[PDB]
Design a binder for these strands. Structure first.
Lengths: 171, 471, 49
DNA sequence: AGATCTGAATTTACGGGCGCAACTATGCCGGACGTACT
DNA sequence: AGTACGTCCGGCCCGTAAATTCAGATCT
RNA sequence: UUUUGGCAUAGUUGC
């Protein structure tokens, strides 16, 4: 879920960018660095809400760079196991289902898929359909899925969706 | 009673020392120099020293005098403690044997025929020989043609053969050896030896349940382990006390959606996650592949490491390179430029990879290694892979989703899209410039200048190549 | 080999007794001048002791 | 008043240290075993 | 059968502690 | 197409 938190980052500014627009330069560099990145413990940083406080620029001995610590309010998506989430199904295959939550990709395995659902390969849209067709899971649909577990590997979170609980799936 | 005193003796010659001292006792039992010691003990498995029974250390010293073998214990002796006197004498303890001596020491040997004479038994063995080529070794099958070709001491009766010190062989060595020269109890060969010719495994951290008893259905994490009666110390759910269970009362139970590794069997080494816990058929899916793997509960352990699941460039021949796609016991599965998977020996050559090599895709875009490229033409059209190796007109693409050859395939580069100077060491003569007259040898050479070690003076200097004239 | 050792390394005494065996008796002959060779021939050393 | 220990104040071994950088020489497995060749 | 050959096993010094000797606590 | 490499005690010599 999106959470508006103050985080810390470090910037080793090179002397070539010194002079006028120094504060603009460190602001731009923090924007370039944090945006579009994922961290395992803190999830997906979405965007810089703002840069709160610019720390003192400690000139590195022996190196020449200047180290700036920066406090910044940023919003982070952190998935929660044991929570229901609205998700957009991206890819549907016979093995499982992939869904998008923000930039993050979650999965619904062949068995985490409910047994009532069954793949429909013969039809023109490849989709999982129930016998009564009260819920039909295809690509590009809004589903309520329970997060079984936030399985994190190398600065990227992939969760597992489940429809075992009632009232889940399409609206 | 008298006390035992330790006397250091020559290693491997204790029983001979005891025999000599008994002979000395009998040879001086009636003389004016009687041996006042009572007995001598030279245990079989205690090597290096012996024991002498006497009431005094002076008796020991005066008795062992004249025995060179005990001279290292002559000056001083140590009494065996009174409470440990029992332990001096306390002694403990189509098949397969293992020969003791010879080059076949501790080698599995199948008892072919047991001679009723009780002197030797016929044993089948694998020869550890060089076939008289190095001497003037590991186990390998007995090659009859090689030892016939090399000659020497060799006699042929078809598959039957005599060679190199009356070694008898047939099709495999078949030679007689004394039972005292082998071990006839406690070999227990492995399955590999059979091809050539219950168990408990509880680990700390693993979760186990209770299958029977008053403490049934209590899942807890293992802390300790022992051999048979473990008396385990499991940390149960909602219980701060530590209870006791043997190996037989537990089972390797695991909740769904947790890391699992296989300890043994056809699925050994593969990791994954268990899905549904049936009575005994536990179904899981690997981190590599998405195939059903059914295992017993005992064939699972709780280990949180990532799966291993490498990819080195090798030369099948100077005309075609190869990329290893699987590592095996004695061979490499190598995927070449043609797309043909081959199986080759360990002794291909490692080529110097050129990581800065430049290749052109199908749209005249420069592409380097680690670049994600889509295949728009060729047999693998539609796939998208990361470049790992390059050729003049081929590129090798890795893809984790593709379960074939470890995800590695190959496509032509034009069907992708990005998503020493001769003058060195030559005697020369300065024909122009201030250094004219002299002779030197060219150490370093360039396009313009060249270093010359000057023969005449104790220095080296650089001169234009125009100033040089070879001898 | 005993005498050859004791002259080869300068150690003087038994080879295994080198812990306390006094050394520094046999030295490489000083061959730089004739006077240096003579001075090394006639040299006498007092141990610290 | 005295003993009798007994609790703090004088004499003996005993490690453990001893100013900075180059150039040459020696030596680090012998005894027993064990079999194969001539 | 003998012997060679090669591979395998077995002065100071200053702290520092420790051993003996006078008052003091009991215990007559 | 890229180079390597020992530890030791002893001895002598140089402000």
């Amino acid at each position: 879920m999106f959470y508006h938190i103050s985080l810390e980052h470090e910037i080793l500014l090179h002397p070539r960018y010194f002079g006028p627009n120094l504060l603009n330069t460190v602001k731009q560099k923090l924007f370039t660095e944090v945006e579009g990145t994922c961290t395992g413990k803190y999830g997906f940083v979405i965007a810089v809400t703002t840069i709160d406080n610019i720390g003192a620029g400690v000139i590195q001995p022996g190196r020449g760079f200047v180290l700036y610590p920066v406090k910044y309010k940023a919003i982070v998506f952190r998935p929660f196991k044991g929570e229901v989430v609205d998700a957009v199904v991206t890819q549907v295959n016979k093995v499982g289902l992939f869904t998008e939550i923000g930039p993050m990709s979650c999965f619904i395995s062949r068995h985490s898929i409910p047994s009532e659902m069954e793949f429909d390969p013969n039809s023109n849209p490849p989709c999982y359909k129930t016998m009564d067709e009260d819920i039909v899971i295809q690509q590009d649909d809004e589903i309520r899925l329970k997060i079984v577990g936030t399985r994190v590997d190398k600065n990227d979170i992939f969760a597992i969706g489940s429809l075992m609980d009632d009232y889940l799936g399409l609206v | 009673d008298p006390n035992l005193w330790t006397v250091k003796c020559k290693i491997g010659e204790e029983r001979a020392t005891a025999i000599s001292l008994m002979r000395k006792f009998i040879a001086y039992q009636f003389t004016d120099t009687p041996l006042q010691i009572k007995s001598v003990v030279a245990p079989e498995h205690v090597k290096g020293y012996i024991y002498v029974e006497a009431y005094k250390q002076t008796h020991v010293k005066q008795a062992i005098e004249g025995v060179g073998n005990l001279r290292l214990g002559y000056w001083n002796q140590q009494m065996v403690p009174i409470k440990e006197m029992t332990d001096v004498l306390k002694v403990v303890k189509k098949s397969w044997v293992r020969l003791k001596r010879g080059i076949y020491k501790d080698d599995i040997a199948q008892v072919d025929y047991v001679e009723p004479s009780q002197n030797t038994i016929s044993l089948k063995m694998i020869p550890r020989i060089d076939y008289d080529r190095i001497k003037a070794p590991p186990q390998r099958l007995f090659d009859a043609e090689k030892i016939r070709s090399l000659g020497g001491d060799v006699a042929s009766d078809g598959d039957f053969l005599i060679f190199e010190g009356n070694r008898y062989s047939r099709k495999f060595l078949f030679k007689s050896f004394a039972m005292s020269a082998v071990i006839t109890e406690g070999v227990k060969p492995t399955l590999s030896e059979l091809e050539k010719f219950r168990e408990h495994n509880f680990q700390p951290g693993d979760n186990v349940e209770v299958c029977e008893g008053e403490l049934i259905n209590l899942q807890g994490k293992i802390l300790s382990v022992d051999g048979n009666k473990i008396t385990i110390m499991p940390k149960h759910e909602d219980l701060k006390d530590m209870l006791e269970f043997p190996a037989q009362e537990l089972r390797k139970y695991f909740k769904m959606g947790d890391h699992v590794k296989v300890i043994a069997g056809r699925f050994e080494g593969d990791t994954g996650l268990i899905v549904r816990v049936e009575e005994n058929f536990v179904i899981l899916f690997s981190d590599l592949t998405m195939h059903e793997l059914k295992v017993l509960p005992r064939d699972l352990q709780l280990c949180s490491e990532t799966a291993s699941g490498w990819g080195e460039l090798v030369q099948l021949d100077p005309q075609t390179v190869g990329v290893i796609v699987r590592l095996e016991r004695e061979t490499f599965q190598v995927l070449n430029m043609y797309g043909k998977v081959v199986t080759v020996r360990h002794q291909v050559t490692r080529k110097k990879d050129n990581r800065f090599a430049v290749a052109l895709d199908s749209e005249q875009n420069n592409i380097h290694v680690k670049d994600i490229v889509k295949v728009i033409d060729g047999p693998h059209s539609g796939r998208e892979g990361e470049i790992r190796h390059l050729f003049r007109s081929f590129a090798f693409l890795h893809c984790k989703k593709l379960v074939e050859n470890g995800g590695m395939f190959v496509c032509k580069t034009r069907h992708l899209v990005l998503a020493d100077n001769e003058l060195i060491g030559q005697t020369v003569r300065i024909s122009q410039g201030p250094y004219k007259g002299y002779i030197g040898v060219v150490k370093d050479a360039t396009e313009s200048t060249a270093r010359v070690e000057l023969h005449s003076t104790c220095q080296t200097i650089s001169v234009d190549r125009q100033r040089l004239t070879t001898v | 080999d005993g005498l050859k050792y004791s002259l080869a390394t300068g150690n003087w005494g038994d080879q295994k007794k080198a812990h306390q065996a006094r050394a520094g008796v046999s030295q490489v002959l000083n061959r730089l001048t004739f006077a240096s060779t003579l001075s090394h021939l006639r040299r006498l050393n007092s141990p610290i002791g």
